[PDB]
Amino acid sequence: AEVYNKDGNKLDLYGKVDGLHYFSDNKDVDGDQTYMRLGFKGETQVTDQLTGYGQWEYQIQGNSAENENNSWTRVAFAGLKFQDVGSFDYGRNYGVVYDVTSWTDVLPEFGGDTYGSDNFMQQRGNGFATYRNTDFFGLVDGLNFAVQYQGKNGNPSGEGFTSGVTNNGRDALRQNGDGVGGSITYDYEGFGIGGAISSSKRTDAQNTAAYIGNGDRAETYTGGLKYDANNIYLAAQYTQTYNATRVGSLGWANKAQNFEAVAQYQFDFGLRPSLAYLQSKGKNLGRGYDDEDILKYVDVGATYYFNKNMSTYVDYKINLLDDNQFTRDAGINTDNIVALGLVYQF
Amino acid sequence: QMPSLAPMLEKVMPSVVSINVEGSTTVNTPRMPRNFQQFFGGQQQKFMALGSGVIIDADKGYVVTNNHVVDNATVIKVQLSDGRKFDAKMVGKDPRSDIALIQIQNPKNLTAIKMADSDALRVGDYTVAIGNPFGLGETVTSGIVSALGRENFIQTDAAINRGNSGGALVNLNGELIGINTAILAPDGGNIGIGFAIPSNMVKNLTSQMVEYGQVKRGELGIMGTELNSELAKAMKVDAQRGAFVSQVLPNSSAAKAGIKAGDVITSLNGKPISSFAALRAQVGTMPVGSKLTLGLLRDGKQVNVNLELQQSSQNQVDSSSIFNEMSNKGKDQGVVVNNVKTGTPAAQIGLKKGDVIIGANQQAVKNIAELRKVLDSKPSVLALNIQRGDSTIYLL
Amino acid sequence: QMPSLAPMLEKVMPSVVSINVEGSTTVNTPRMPRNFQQFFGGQQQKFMALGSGVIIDADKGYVVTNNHVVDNATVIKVQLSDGRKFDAKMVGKDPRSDIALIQIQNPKNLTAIKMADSDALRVGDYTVAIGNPFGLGETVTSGIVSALGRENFIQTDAAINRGNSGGALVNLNGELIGINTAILAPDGGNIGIGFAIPSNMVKNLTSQMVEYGQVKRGELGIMGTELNSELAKAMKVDAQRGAFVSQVLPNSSAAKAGIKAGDVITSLNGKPISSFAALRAQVGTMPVGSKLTLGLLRDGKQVNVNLELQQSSQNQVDSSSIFNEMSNKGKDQGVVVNNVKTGTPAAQIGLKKGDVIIGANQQAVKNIAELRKVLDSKPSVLALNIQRGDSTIYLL
Amino acid sequence: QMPSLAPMLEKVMPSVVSINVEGSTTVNTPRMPRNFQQFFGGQQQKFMALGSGVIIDADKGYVVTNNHVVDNATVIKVQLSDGRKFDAKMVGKDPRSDIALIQIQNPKNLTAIKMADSDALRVGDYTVAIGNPFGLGETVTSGIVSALGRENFIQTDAAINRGNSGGALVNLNGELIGINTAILAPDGGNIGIGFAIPSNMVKNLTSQMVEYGQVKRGELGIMGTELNSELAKAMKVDAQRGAFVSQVLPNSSAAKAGIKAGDVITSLNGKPISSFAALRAQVGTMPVGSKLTLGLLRDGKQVNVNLELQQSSQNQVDSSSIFNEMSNKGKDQGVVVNNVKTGTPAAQIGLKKGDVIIGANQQAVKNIAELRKVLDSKPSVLALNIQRGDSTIYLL
Known part of the structure; x- marks a missing residue:
């Protein structure tokens, strides 16, 4: 909702409450999953060509008792945009690989989980410096590219570490050395085609015997396709990764091949059914694991839109992973899940 | 003039038929949208299959074929090599051997192949396969007996690169020695060489x-x-x-x-x-x-x-x-x-x-x-x- | 002693030539950097092609070959089986049939193959293909007539696993019966078996x-x-x-x-x-x-x-x-x-x-x-x- | 009756043996966990190999085979075609040619193949290969001499789709003309056609x-x-x-x-x-x-x-x-x-x-x-x- 628009400054205050419940034989995901998100997007006109902006988004879980608080910052960044040249922003933001993979992250509840948060340059993460050029100086409609740098996020401070520390340090599964990446997308009418590449130094804390997938750098290569017209949405992405994909709590995959596909239709009366397939196939994993499925599921669901502010959905994760030693060791969910959600948003 | 397999093939072809199956099966309901960068993991669906078969009883209109072709059939059609068309019904099938029997409904003037004695086969023996590789029709390919198992699956190099496991395996005399099969189940298609059930087992x-x-x-x-x-x-x-x-x-x-x-x-x-x-x-x-x-x-x-x-x-x-x-x-x-x-x-x-x-x-x-x-x-x-x-x- | 195809191959090879094409084409300008985890979506570029051909007129130095080899050629070279080298020029081509004609510039002492009558072909008939599979030279492979279309593309199992659609298809008498082609256009390479244009159509x-x-x-x-x-x-x-x-x-x-x-x-x-x-x-x-x-x-x-x-x-x-x-x-x-x-x-x-x-x-x-x-x-x-x-x- | 390669194969098979190698090698230590969406980049590991070989000296129990089979062997076992089992030891190997020699320990009543003169080979000549394609045993496949190099690697279409480069290449007289090899090193498996070292080079x-x-x-x-x-x-x-x-x-x-x-x-x-x-x-x-x-x-x-x-x-x-x-x-x-x-x-x-x-x-x-x-x-x-x-x- 735009709550302020005066003398060239605009402020949009937005959010949602998702009354949400999971049904699953897996009791670690089963039960109340209610949550809310809040955010703001602000923009200020500096000149006719130059605009400054900032965005912040926060998630607060609504499913805990009052003696605890489970909340986090999704994004927080400030930036400058110049008409027909580009933009730059810095902060917690999305990695440029997400420019392509976001195209299949459109499912009612699940999806978008061949990668995670704080996972090199694949999704949300800290310390992104992002440069973007839209429409190639305004001379090629629909063509966009981006180049991104990520600074090191290392070991926690004040915990007796003698190397690799940063002020905002964290556990090794969520660390990263310096990284660089890029994306190109082209959209003509309904069609879209895109590609992205990322390369991040891996830290010493990540390259210990306690984690599978030791390596100097984490690399990702992504291609994507999209069709979005005539009430039909189709998209697919394929990603090859090296020492970049987490294998639950075990560490990372030496190599992984990720694939996601989605098909959706929008009825006039407000119903939007969705069908999707995701898989992540790991190779040469180490410790005798050899080749294993990290993720494999079919997602069938539907959303009903009452209007732009109220909707309800059901999403059914038909989980094709089988319960074995590998998935047990990594703590990967192999059970089906049904989600039922009712969402108010502004 | 020059040697040729055409003279015995002309005495054999009238026994080889084409088979068109129409049927349905249970498939899972597609979940949309489709995300090709997301490796995941009831309704009847019609499908079409096609294969070859061999007339084994001219009077009863009995045709032998692969079970991977007629399995789940609702409608099974047969077309003779002269172009006459007939309907057929299931009379038997056995997934282990991947062998099935059918019966032409209303046969008229049919020709049956003679079955030879599988037990007399030897490795350097010449072999000829007849089948419908890519749908485009009835293809014959030649070769020899590669391995005699010794279940006695027959192995032969008269196969086809990337094609579906055809049907008849015949010797130089035009007699049936084995029915070619597919050991790549619920697929059809070969491993690189051909596997046939021996004629004596087919008879049995x-x-x-x-x-x-x-x-x-x-x-x-x-x-x-x-x-x-x-x-x-x-x-x-x-x-x-x-x-x-x-x-x-x-x-x-x-x-x-x-x-x-x-x-x-x-x-x-x-x-x-x-x-x-x-x-x-x-x-x-x-x-x-x-x-x-x-x-x-x-x-x-x-x-x-x-x-x-x-x-x-x-x-x-x-x-x-x-x-x-x-x-x-x-x-x-x-x-x-x-x-x-x-x-x-x-x-x-x-x-x-x-x-x-x-x-x-x-x-x-x-x-x-x-x-x-x-x-x-x-x-x-x-x-x-x-x-x-x-x-x-x-x-x- | 023992049977062999070498005696007729010696009367055939002088008619089969090798062909080296050099030419250019329009390719799109590469956009950098290159991101292999980003599925996207003018300048002349030289390329080299190589294939086989058959001398069809010794006097005029007329060589038949595939259009997928000479297409877009700027320079077309020919090397006889005895090793003599010549230059050639386009005289004709027809993308539908994937057949092309060229002329050796300055022929001297050439041998032409005799063309047999395609119409007399039958399925069990023996077949021999001659081509340049992987560039390494002139390979001959043998087999039989698999399917006689009936356009009458000839189907034969004398092909090559993963190789480029060679050229000449000859009978046991050394006569030309078809020119092997590639039905996997703008690729070259086969589907699993071989497809040839019949000699009578080639002549025409x-x-x-x-x-x-x-x-x-x-x-x-x-x-x-x-x-x-x-x-x-x-x-x-x-x-x-x-x-x-x-x-x-x-x-x-x-x-x-x-x-x-x-x-x-x-x-x-x-x-x-x-x-x-x-x-x-x-x-x-x-x-x-x-x-x-x-x-x-x-x-x-x-x-x-x-x-x-x-x-x-x-x-x-x-x-x-x-x-x-x-x-x-x-x-x-x-x-x-x-x-x-x-x-x-x-x-x-x-x-x-x-x-x-x-x-x-x-x-x-x-x-x-x-x-x-x-x-x-x-x-x-x-x-x-x-x-x-x-x-x-x-x-x- | 009908022609067959079985009569000479019976005089040849006793010279072809099967070979089972057991040995180890140095592999890198797996780093865990394993992330299949992360393209990365010492301990002995046992492995098993299997191939064919040809008895070349009945008295000394000398068997010729491919170096890609016995390489790194710790234990090499041999099984005759009649089923008798023996042990073998390395006597020689040469990675360039991909040819190796072994010796049956304690031979008793063995049969050796006769080696023919490679130099007399010609392209239309008939060829027969004998090997163990997928482990399932001893397979023979037939064909002809495709290319005579002219190192004189012999090229033949008697290969196998997706299988491992077998061993013996024999003419219609049952004489050894070449040992089939694998030009897809540290792999085994063919490019589409077969490559053999000529018998005369094998002897040498x-x-x-x-x-x-x-x-x-x-x-x-x-x-x-x-x-x-x-x-x-x-x-x-x-x-x-x-x-x-x-x-x-x-x-x-x-x-x-x-x-x-x-x-x-x-x-x-x-x-x-x-x-x-x-x-x-x-x-x-x-x-x-x-x-x-x-x-x-x-x-x-x-x-x-x-x-x-x-x-x-x-x-x-x-x-x-x-x-x-x-x-x-x-x-x-x-x-x-x-x-x-x-x-x-x-x-x-x-x-x-x-x-x-x-x-x-x-x-x-x-x-x-x-x-x-x-x-x-x-x-x-x-x-x-x-x-x-x-x-x-x-x-x-």
Whole structure:
């Protein structure tokens, strides 16, 4: 909702409450999953060509008792945009690989989980410096590219570490050395085609015997396709990764091949059914694991839109992973899940 | 002039037919949208299959073919090499061998191939395969006998790169020596060379379908695999050198007589059993009602028992010329019906899960061959003298 | 001693040549950097191709080969089996059949193969293929006639796993029975078995290139596909069982005479047209200037018309022995030039988009065979008596 | 009746054996967990290999086979076609040709194939291959001589789609004409057609292993590649048309005599060297101690020198019937030991990096054939009269 628009400054205050419940034989995901998100997007006109902006988004879980608080910052960044040249922003933001993979992250509840948060340059993460050029100086409609740098996020401070520390340090599964990446997308009418590449130094804390997938750098290569017209949405992405994909709590995959596909239709009366397939196939994993499925599921669901502010959905994760030693060791969910959600948003 | 296989091919082709199957199956419901960068993990769906077959009885219009072609068929069409078209009905099938029998409805002037004696085959022997590789028609390819198994699957280099496992394997005299198959199940397509069931086995399996309704192959009703499987490890099995029992089948002889998942069979009638494989093949050299005592392993357990007809080879909507999954029961002790479905067209007719049918709508139905022999002669009044153990009702 | 194909191969090899093509093409400009985890979506680029060919006229040095090898050639070299090297020039090509003709420049002591009569081929007949599979040289492989189409593409198992569609298909007498082709266009490489154009068709298409400059095949000038395409759905087509017209070609007879995208042809001269396929093949059994009335479907539309030479088979820098895309126009009504380019070496010479050339630099040029017959005899003074409809200019 | 290859195959099969190798190798230590969406980038690991071989000396129990099968073997087993089992030991191997020799331990009643004269082969000639394609056993496939190289690798279409490069290539008389190989090193498996070493070369390489311990092939000891490599560009090489020297091997003749990475050899004994390929093959037509003067390029450098035995073909734990990597040194100037290992079982016996052995535990050991000829006759007392240049010690 735009709550302020005066003398060239605009402020949009937005959010949602998702009354949400999971049904699953897996009791670690089963039960109340209610949550809310809040955010703001602000923009200020500096000149006719130059605009400054900032965005912040926060998630607060609504499913805990009052003696605890489970909340986090999704994004927080400030930036400058110049008409027909580009933009730059810095902060917690999305990695440029997400420019392509976001195209299949459109499912009612699940999806978008061949990668995670704080996972090199694949999704949300800290310390992104992002440069973007839209429409190639305004001379090629629909063509966009981006180049991104990520600074090191290392070991926690004040915990007796003698190397690799940063002020905002964290556990090794969520660390990263310096990284660089890029994306190109082209959209003509309904069609879209895109590609992205990322390369991040891996830290010493990540390259210990306690984690599978030791390596100097984490690399990702992504291609994507999209069709979005005539009430039909189709998209697919394929990603090859090296020492970049987490294998639950075990560490990372030496190599992984990720694939996601989605098909959706929008009825006039407000119903939007969705069908999707995701898989992540790991190779040469180490410790005798050899080749294993990290993720494999079919997602069938539907959303009903009452209007732009109220909707309800059901999403059914038909989980094709089988319960074995590998998935047990990594703590990967192999059970089906049904989600039922009712969402108010502004 | 120059040598050619065309002269014998002209005496052979009239026996090779083309087969077009139309049928449906249960597929999962697609979940949308589709995300190709997201590796995940009921409705009938029509499909079309096509394959070759060989006329084996000109009078009865009996055509032998692969079970991977006619399986799940609703409609099976046949086209002779001269172009005449006919309809066909299932008479038998056996997924193990991947061999099936069909019958042309209303045959007129047909030619049957002569079957040669598989047992006289030798490796340097010349071979010729005939099939429909990519749908585009009837292709013949030549070669020799590569390996004579010694089950005696025949191995031959007269195959086809990337094509579907055709059908007839014929010698230089135009006689049938084997039916080419597909060992890449629920696929069709080869490993690099060709595998055929030998003509003598084809003759044998085929007659059974005719004179009984199905092939007399008893199953031990266990299901399981090797000692490498994730479950053999996830359950840590002591002394690994045998067949791992993942589960004992319901209402089975293994179940009835005694056995439970985990035990690893070590022998069968005194002889060592080092792999499910060895076992699956050994139990396949024993017709129903046979008795085979095997040694199990838990701490040191062993038993003796008698097996019944397998469940893989069964019948469906072809017993009653009408339309609607029975199979044979023990010796000539009627025809026992199995797992009924959801549409329930046959259950709706008073037929439960274990209903035998010794009454041929009036007479003796020791088997599906006989039963079907009656539901084809007198299609007027039908009263199925079924007795599922106790209840001896007479439905229409 | 022992049988061998070496004795006839020695009488055949001198007719098989190797072919090295050098040429360029237009490729898109690479966008950098390169991100292999980002599935996206003008400059000449040199490429090299290599294939086999067969000497078909020893005196004229006429070699038959695949169009997928010489297409876009700038330089075409030929090496005999004895090792002598020569240069060659394009004389003809026809992308449909994937067959092309070339001429060795300055032949000396050549041997030509004898062509056998394709029509006498039968399936069990023996076959031998000769080609250059992986570049490493001239490989011969043997087999038999697998399928005789019945266009009569010949099917044979004398192919090669993963290799490029070679060239000559010869019978046991060393006579040419077909030229092996590639049905995996703009690729080369096979589907699993071999496809050859029959020798009789090769003879026929080949003579046309000689005596006319190109093959007389008329096009209906429509372009489109089946009724499954995204456009047949995205545009919802009523009554689907025919050829979908995606577009009517410019300056075409379909265009001229009347027709517009959408209509689905249902028949051609009374006969049913159930697929673009059926149609594309039927229009290929009709030489230029022919008249074929077909039924369209919009609500119920139908017309009659006469087609002109196709645009696929055309000429370029080989008409004028010099260097620089014409083709024939109707019957012997001169040589009509088509789409000029950007470098404009020939446009620069006063030749527009629709300029005929009935004047053989002085004489009659009813066709490219004749025209080229003059730009080869008198390379001294050249004045092209061209008349693009009205303007009758005389450029040098 | 009908023709068949079975009659000669019965006279051939007793000479073809199966081979089961068991051995280990060094693999990298797996890093966990495993992330399949993360393209990355010491412990012995047992592996099993299996292949075919041909009995070439019935008395000595000499079997020829591929080096890609027995390489790194710890245990090599052989099973005759009649089913008798034996043990075998390495006697020789040569990675270039991918050919190896072994000896059945304790032969009894063996049959050896007759070797035919490779030089009399011609392209249309008939061919038959015998091998163990997928492990399932001994498969024979037939065909013809496709290409006669002219090193004379034989090319034949008697191969196998997706299978491992078998072994024997035999003519219609049952005589050995070539041993089938794998040109897809450290893989096994074919490119689409078959490549065999000719029987005459097999005879020649094989005798060397017997009468010397290894094959007399001298190496120039340089290592490098073409002028396209990233290093030829990343280092910008002037005048590119030759072999790029990426590195000069240590303790080599190229090293000793003079040469340094970068120089691009342009000739060898006056003749042009346009590719590493050309060179690698030319240096392979020269036995040890030979002298070959070649022209290098830096600004214009050229030298002359004499090469020594290559390091690819070497011995290990088969010289001393006991168990524990030597090779021959120059002419009959003893047996020079090379790079010792970490387990150090042989270094532990007083054997350094460059220790010759002219003393046959008492006598003359001009070579490994002789040396091994003694460590097999008198396995009682052993004192190795080794002298690594100066030190002339006598260890046990």
